[PDB]
Design a protein around this nucleic acid. Structure first.
Ligand SMILES: [Mg+2]
Ligand SMILES: [Mg+2]
Ligand SMILES: [Mg+2]
Ligand SMILES: [Mg+2]
Ligand SMILES: [Mg+2]
Ligand SMILES: [Mg+2]
Ligand SMILES: [Mg+2]
Ligand SMILES: [Mg+2]
Ligand SMILES: [Mg+2]
Ligand SMILES: [Mg+2]
Ligand SMILES: [Mg+2]
Ligand SMILES: [Mg+2]
Ligand SMILES: [Mg+2]
Ligand SMILES: [Mg+2]
Ligand SMILES: [Mg+2]
Ligand SMILES: [Mg+2]
Ligand SMILES: [Mg+2]
Ligand SMILES: [Mg+2]
Ligand SMILES: [Mg+2]
Ligand SMILES: [Mg+2]
Ligand SMILES: [Mg+2]
Ligand SMILES: [Mg+2]
Ligand SMILES: [Mg+2]
Ligand SMILES: [Mg+2]
Ligand SMILES: [Mg+2]
Ligand SMILES: [Mg+2]
Ligand SMILES: [Mg+2]
Ligand SMILES: [Mg+2]
Ligand SMILES: [Mg+2]
Ligand SMILES: [Mg+2]
Ligand SMILES: [Mg+2]
Ligand SMILES: [Mg+2]
Ligand SMILES: [Mg+2]
Ligand SMILES: [Mg+2]
Ligand SMILES: [Mg+2]
Ligand SMILES: [Mg+2]
Ligand SMILES: [Mg+2]
Ligand SMILES: [Mg+2]
Ligand SMILES: [Mg+2]
Ligand SMILES: [Mg+2]
Ligand SMILES: [Mg+2]
Ligand SMILES: [Mg+2]
Ligand SMILES: [Mg+2]
Ligand SMILES: [Mg+2]
Ligand SMILES: [Mg+2]
Ligand SMILES: [Mg+2]
Ligand SMILES: [Mg+2]
Ligand SMILES: [Mg+2]
Ligand SMILES: [Mg+2]
Ligand SMILES: [Mg+2]
Ligand SMILES: [Mg+2]
Ligand SMILES: [Mg+2]
Ligand SMILES: [Mg+2]
Ligand SMILES: [Mg+2]
Ligand SMILES: [Mg+2]
Ligand SMILES: [Mg+2]
Ligand SMILES: [Mg+2]
Ligand SMILES: [Mg+2]
Ligand SMILES: [Mg+2]
Ligand SMILES: [Mg+2]
Ligand SMILES: [Mg+2]
Ligand SMILES: [Mg+2]
Ligand SMILES: [Mg+2]
Ligand SMILES: [Mg+2]
Ligand SMILES: [Mg+2]
Ligand SMILES: [Mg+2]
Ligand SMILES: [Mg+2]
Ligand SMILES: [Mg+2]
Ligand SMILES: [Mg+2]
Ligand SMILES: [Mg+2]
Ligand SMILES: [Mg+2]
Ligand SMILES: [Mg+2]
Ligand SMILES: [Mg+2]
Ligand SMILES: [Mg+2]
Length: 245
RNA sequence: GCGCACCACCGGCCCGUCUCGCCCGCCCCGUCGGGGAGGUGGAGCGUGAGCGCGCGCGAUAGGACCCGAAAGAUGGUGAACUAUGCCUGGGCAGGGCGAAGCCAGAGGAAACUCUGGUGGAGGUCCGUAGCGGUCCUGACGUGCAAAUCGGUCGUCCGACCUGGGUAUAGGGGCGAAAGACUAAUCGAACCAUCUAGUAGCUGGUUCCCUCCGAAGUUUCCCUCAGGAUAGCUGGCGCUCGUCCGUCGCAGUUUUAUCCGGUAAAGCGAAUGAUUAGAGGUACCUAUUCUCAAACUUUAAAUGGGUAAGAAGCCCGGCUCGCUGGCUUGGAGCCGGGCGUGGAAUGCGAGCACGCCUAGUGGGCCACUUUUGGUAAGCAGAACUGGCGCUGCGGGAUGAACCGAACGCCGGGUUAAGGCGCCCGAUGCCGACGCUCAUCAGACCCCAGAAAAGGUGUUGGUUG
RNA sequence: CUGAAAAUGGAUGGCGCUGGAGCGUCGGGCCCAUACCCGGCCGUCGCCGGCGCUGGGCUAGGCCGCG
RNA sequence: GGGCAGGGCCGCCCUGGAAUGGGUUCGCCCCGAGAGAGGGGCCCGCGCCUUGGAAAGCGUCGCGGGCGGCGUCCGGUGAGCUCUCGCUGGCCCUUGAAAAUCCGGGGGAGAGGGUGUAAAUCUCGCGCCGGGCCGUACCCAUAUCCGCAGCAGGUCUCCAAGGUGAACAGCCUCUGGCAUGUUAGAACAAUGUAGGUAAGGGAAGUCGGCAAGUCAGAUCCGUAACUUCGGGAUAAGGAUUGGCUCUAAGGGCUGGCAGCUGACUUAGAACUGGUGCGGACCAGGGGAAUCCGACUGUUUAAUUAAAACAAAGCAUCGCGAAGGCCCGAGGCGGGUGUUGACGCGAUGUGAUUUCUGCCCAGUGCUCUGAGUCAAAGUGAAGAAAUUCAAUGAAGCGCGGGUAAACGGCAAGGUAGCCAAAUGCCUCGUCAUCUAAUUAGUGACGCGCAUGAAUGGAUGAACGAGAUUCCCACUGUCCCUACCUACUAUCUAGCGAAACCACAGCCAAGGGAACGGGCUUGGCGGAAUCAGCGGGGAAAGAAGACCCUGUUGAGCUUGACUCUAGUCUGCAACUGUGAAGUUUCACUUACCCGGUGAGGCGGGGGGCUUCUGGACCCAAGCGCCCGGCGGGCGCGACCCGCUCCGAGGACAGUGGCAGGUGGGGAGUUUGACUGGGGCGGUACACCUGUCAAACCGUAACGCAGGUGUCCUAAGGCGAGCUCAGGGAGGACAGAAACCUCCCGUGGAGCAGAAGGGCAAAAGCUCGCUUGAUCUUGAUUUUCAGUAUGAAUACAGACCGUGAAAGCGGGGCCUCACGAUCCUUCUGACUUUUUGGGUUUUAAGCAGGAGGUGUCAGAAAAGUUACCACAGGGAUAACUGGCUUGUGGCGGCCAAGCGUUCAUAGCGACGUCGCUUUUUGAUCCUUCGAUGUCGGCUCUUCCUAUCAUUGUGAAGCAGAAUUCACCAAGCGUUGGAUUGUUCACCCACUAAUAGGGAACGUGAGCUGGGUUUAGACCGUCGUGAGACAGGUUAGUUUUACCCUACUGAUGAUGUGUUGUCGCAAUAGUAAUCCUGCUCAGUACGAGAGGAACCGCAGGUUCAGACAUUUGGUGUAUGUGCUUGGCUGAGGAGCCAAUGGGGCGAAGCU
């Protein structure tokens, strides 16, 4: 049989991301001497909408600590910030919404976003609209902080991972029911070519493991193993359990 | 009498192997090497016949008599059609209902309600362009057109329509998913090559004449549309014979002697089935009715085997390690003597009916016999003939029936079948009867009749 | 003769036949098959075939004879 | 270019200060963060004027590339139409490009001259010079492009007049364009294609209201059930509509009410007419329900627009980046990812509302720590190869969880729902719907085989979806007719194609079982025209259906054998150190992240949180060099080995090993067979029979057996005699044991059967291992090969008996297996390759391990998405043989008929016929005979329902029954169903039965069936299947030959014409009612005829148009809409403008 739809996405021909009108990569500043030994004053110049993501992006401007240059960054806009606000980045910056602080220099239970997964990755965790990470506890011996991710998992990261205090703006976006199919079309028309999802039971056996039969049954158990080959790994991949929770 | 070649048979020898064994040899005396006797395995020996060349045929492997697949593989070319994403442009009358927001006037004790207007929302409605393509299953249907035309119809601010520029390439692409679409090609494109792919399967296979002439059956086969094998065929011969005579031969009789368990018969005989009384005391005896394919005491017809001499008979001896009371057997061998060849008839035989060998291995039909089946122009056997391979006369006609089989002709005579005319032959003064039919009847196979009836007519029988 | 009814118009073969061209029993005569008899020609096959002993003859791989 | 209108600054300026808040728009909006007002400023000014500039251009009048005259003017309006510039708002889980290029500002390093200039000057204003290369024609589409073409197809745009009207609708005209689309003339037949009308009835047509028609615009009214409150809705149902003549209402400007001036509409009224008025054009039929899908959207280009897909919603699953998912031959590869759980990826269900039950056994997924377990490694034995042992990963196994996982209902179908798109029986039962209903709806539910995200139930709105009814409408129909246009037709010119063995009149017979040719008959007359669709089993295509092939392909799995990927283990890359094979540490390989690798580590010295500003290119000091300039240091600490961090000898890499692996690859999926499959094994064997007296002899013939059993049930000897019966004998009996007698085997002999068998072959007993070691020959199946199983010897060694003898398995006939490979035994001058020794390996010989498809491949499906080679060797459709079955008819006479066998019947039996049932068969056809029904239409049969003429009765009349001559004539209209077949409603003289390739598809219709789409049920793990249901699904060609229908003509008697004859062929009328006979005959009554006669009708036939109706393009005459001809008048155009009436003709 021919390859399944799930296999053609890794080729990257028509399933690539629509990144034409995107305003840039949202990431923190480069970790320098100003943020490891003090703070640097920024200024929010504009809060823009990035096509593809439901969270706004802030165009924060900084001064280059070594050249007469205006460094403009693109952060994930925390909810509550506005244009004209002075945000600060570093370990000696105060605990305010929008400031970029290490996760080790903050009290427990601090709500932060855009958390660096590794020290200096310029922010990876909790960057979607309406999400945040909570600093659970610290460990001054190993210099490791334990953070609670939006998925409920508690990850032990380094205490030097910077993060933006607050919650990512654009929260409550999923609380609105998309009423039309056209609204869902425009939602993914900027993301990628994946919205109209034909059921595997509606296809033919050549195109999908679940296709075929005089009826549209699945036939085989929908719970597939983890080590299934590409082309058979459909349905519920490595499902620990099934049924209504 | 010497006997060629050849053949039957019996010795003999070589190698393997087996059984039983008592001798022998030596410088390299040993777990040494040799030989005997009797069976047996071998593509042996037994005073070579091969080799080279050419011709022909046969079975093969090669494109392999020619043409033909659905496929498979390697490499490559296509997104000018179309499917989808992206980029950059273009385009989308006139009307209907009329959402939030707003204004005003009212009602009310208050909360709050009501009315008018305004506003112009929406995968809204009618609908043009556009894009689609419902129904007529209309037109056309060797068309205008390898998908079009007309009316009608869907939608027409949206998941809308479209050009251009780009992206994805064949077991891949893409797919709001029809196995759709990917250049009139898609349940795996196109191009060239591998490739003259293979085919137990269809089709075809080119001059004349002479002579001979089949098989659809046996066994085996992942066989049953096919092969292998045996049979049937042809060719090539060869060994002899070829007046009587003698060898030899036979789809035949005769004589002699065996074999069988079918028809018929039997069950008052066995086994099995079965009817009715009778006698003696439900049985028991003697009877009685009806039967067998997997019953039988009996038992044919047809049919099968053998024999009908010289490879014999007769007389006299020899060999043996087998046999043994004893030449006692048995078999072999030797010498001599004896054709009236030791049934009829016909006939040339032999070489494992030699050597090579094509075709065939779908059969079919009839008398009789016979199985399944209500039956069948049904299915399945035995035997013989026939058709197929075969024309001819006759049955009007027709692969099989009847007669008879075939070079080219003349005369004659017939077969089966015919002789009113078609149509050769009764254009006999044929014989004897039978029969009237308002559906008469008119002859193998054979191509429509039954049970039951008639005071039609003609015979006969018993009263 | 009754019993005896199928669909295009039709099949002793047809015409037709009733002192028979019907049925049964027979007689004489007659008709013709590539069958049988005799004869011619052609070929094949078989002759323990014939001829080297010449008007003709014997290209013997020829000629001739017989069935 | 300049100037000025005009427009915009709710985005600017100054004054000032607001509530009695004001300003203001179509809408909004605006203001103490400052309104209103006044006065300014800026941007855009494509407008006007003007330089250009009228000299040119144009119109017109002249005159001779030109000369001239004159004119080119003054105005006024707008929801007008396009274009453009602004203002302002709405919508997005949609935020709707980059770069070249150009400009402004911040900063002030520097530059410039020392008293008139210098630096400098943004086209400031002018002057001077240069601007290369390529493309440029024309078509741009009913003839310049593509589709083989001058092809009714296709192919991206730009500009857009008047009238009507809401309109870029339709219709008419102007500018512009064209010649009717690759020909013309004549005629006006059939049949067509397109358009239209039709009286009376109104779906009776048909599978089905298919097609057609009705409705339609606007205005004023009136608008239910239901609902998600949005809708339904143009619901439905009504009225009005012309022309003309008026009235009233809705503005602006100027002057302070007056004057002037509109241009677009509404409302009311009068008059008027052949009641006609959205007059043409344009332009929804409606309602009551069921089924499915929520909707909009999308889909098989070229047969399926759907109930399919999608969809929002719902739910589940994976994953925190060293990741999930996926690509990839390969890398520090690539996609999602410019991403980060409100994310991405994988599925299921399918809006809302309402619920979503039970089962974790099976399969699958997932989660745990106590038998199996590879390579490597360790240990042991051995000369070594080798062998053995221990250890022993993942995975499996064990255990838990999981069903909005597959599924089922280990659990036994809960809530619901239903004879449903799902119910076999079935046309279920009941009610309703109709005169009549296999349909529809509402109910009933042990439901063949409903059922809950394999989703159950409901449901407004919506639908080119399926279905039922009603209203309205209509030529769908009763029942056809007429008119118009283009064809056909004829002529001029032009001019193909399919097809074709030869060809073309039939009946019957036979035949390859449906001839055109042969046979026997009928008979047959040139050359042709227009038609026609009976025939040529017509053409079109080496049947796609069925089967075969040791031919494939698509797809699927619990098929065979592999594989990418993935998991896991070992050593290598792989270093350092500590502690008890593990853990904590080290960095240095390796790995990841960040950055323009910008401040690291160790010492010394001593700094930014109020604001949408600004921030660099050292001030200062110290030192030094030049003739007013320049340089250096400090300012800004020193030193240093990895840029800084996160990992780290683990990830990872390469190489082996195990697991997993339809993701993928290759292949396979026996044969026989009254088609095939299913079943069976008739596939290797045995007995009886078939089998026809040797042997042999077939079928999916008949009745059975076999894949064993036996240390004796083998071998030998000896003794003994069985089954059963009679008579007896304590318990003891119909059967216990003892005795006698009879007992041809009637018992037994392992088994199926047959044969054989009595001091045997049976039974019992005691000695045994001839069931041993060998060679060859022979028999049977046979090819006379093998195997299997047998026969008779011989040579050994034994058993047994006193011995003769008997015995190398079973009393005989069945009870079994090649090569290769493995294993065992035995033997020897056997090999182990230059010799020797010992291991090992090989060989010889004999057994065993097994191929049951049994002379011996290694083997699951599915295909309707299918393909090829073929096959009438072989199925489904006709015909042919057969007639079991079906239908029909005799014979015999038990009996029925109150009595009486035969008026009418006919049991038990029995004989036939028919080919309108079905079956059987497989002869014809698979290089194709279109296949069900209906419609249409003709002819035929009689086994007569009715009519005609009769006979019979359990015939009084009437009605009816039976039978005869008899097929001339007729056998109907409807509901339901695709249906033939049934059933019912009526009508009728009767509503008889059949054939003709189950007549009739180049006649039709596609309803059924019968491709591909899709749903449901059952079934299968699955792909799929289902003669179960349901929905949508291309019906091609005649001009050829005959046949038939008509039309010319041909025929020979001289030509020609009129008037006739006539063979032969066709043939046609039919049934009924009323009245009278007649309330008569007959009968007790009730009832109730018949002949003649009479008046009409039904069906059919041939005509015909006086009349009535219909058509009507005499385009005849009126009316009228839109437009046009300046108006009237007269007319035209709108593919027949529409409508009224209408001659002739046809009907
Ligand atoms: Mg599908
Ligand atoms: Mg499936
Ligand atoms: Mg299932
Ligand atoms: Mg292959
Ligand atoms: Mg509507
Ligand atoms: Mg349209
Ligand atoms: Mg169309
Ligand atoms: Mg059509
Ligand atoms: Mg046509
Ligand atoms: Mg519509
Ligand atoms: Mg494009
Ligand atoms: Mg390739
Ligand atoms: Mg399909
Ligand atoms: Mg001959
Ligand atoms: Mg034969
Ligand atoms: Mg053949
Ligand atoms: Mg042969
Ligand atoms: Mg052969
Ligand atoms: Mg054959
Ligand atoms: Mg037969
Ligand atoms: Mg047969
Ligand atoms: Mg033959
Ligand atoms: Mg012969
Ligand atoms: Mg005959
Ligand atoms: Mg003669
Ligand atoms: Mg004759
Ligand atoms: Mg009688
Ligand atoms: Mg008769
Ligand atoms: Mg002669
Ligand atoms: Mg400056
Ligand atoms: Mg210049
Ligand atoms: Mg041009
Ligand atoms: Mg043209
Ligand atoms: Mg024209
Ligand atoms: Mg009418
Ligand atoms: Mg009807
Ligand atoms: Mg219609
Ligand atoms: Mg309604
Ligand atoms: Mg319902
Ligand atoms: Mg829909
Ligand atoms: Mg289509
Ligand atoms: Mg699910
Ligand atoms: Mg489980
Ligand atoms: Mg229930
Ligand atoms: Mg109805
Ligand atoms: Mg119902
Ligand atoms: Mg459930
Ligand atoms: Mg629709
Ligand atoms: Mg013919
Ligand atoms: Mg045909
Ligand atoms: Mg074929
Ligand atoms: Mg085969
Ligand atoms: Mg395929
Ligand atoms: Mg496969
Ligand atoms: Mg295959
Ligand atoms: Mg088979
Ligand atoms: Mg016999
Ligand atoms: Mg012996
Ligand atoms: Mg056949
Ligand atoms: Mg019968
Ligand atoms: Mg009877
Ligand atoms: Mg009759
Ligand atoms: Mg009808
Ligand atoms: Mg038919
Ligand atoms: Mg026909
Ligand atoms: Mg047709
Ligand atoms: Mg038909
Ligand atoms: Mg249909
Ligand atoms: Mg279908
Ligand atoms: Mg009376
Ligand atoms: Mg007018
Ligand atoms: Mg027009
Ligand atoms: Mg018109
Ligand atoms: Mg009229």
């Amino acid at each position: 049989g021919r390859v399944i739809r799930g296999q053609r996405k890794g080729a990257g021909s028509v399933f690539k991301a629509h990144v034409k009108h995107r305003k840039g990569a949202a990431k923190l500043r480069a970790i320098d001497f100003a943020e490891r030994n003090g703070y640097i004053k920024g200024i929010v110049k504009d809060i823009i909408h990035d096509p593809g993501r439901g969270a706004p992006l802030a165009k924060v401007a900084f001064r280059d600590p070594y050249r007469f240059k205006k460094r403009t960054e693109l952060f994930v806009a925390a909810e509550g910030i506005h244009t004209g606000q002075f945000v600060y980045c570093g370990k000696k910056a105060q605990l305010n919404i929008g400031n970029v602080l290490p996760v080790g220099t903050m009290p427990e239970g601090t709500i932060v976003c855009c958390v660096e997964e590794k020290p200096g990755d310029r922010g990876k965790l909790a960057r979607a609209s309406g999400n945040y990470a909570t600093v659970i506890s610290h460990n001054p011996e190993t210099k490791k902080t334990r953070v609670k991710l939006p998925s409920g998992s508690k990850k032990v990261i380094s205490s030097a991972n910077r993060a933006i205090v607050g919650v990512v703006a654009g929260g409550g976006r999923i609380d609105k029911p998309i009423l039309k199919a056209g609204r869902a079309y425009h939602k993914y028309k900027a993301k990628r070519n994946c919205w109209p999802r034909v059921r595997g039971v509606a296809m033919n056996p050549v195109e999908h493991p679940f296709g075929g039969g005089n009826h549209q049954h699945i036939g085989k158990p929908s719970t597939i193993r983890r080590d299934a080959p590409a082309g058979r790994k459909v349905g519920l991949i490595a499902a620990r359990r099934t049924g209504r929770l």
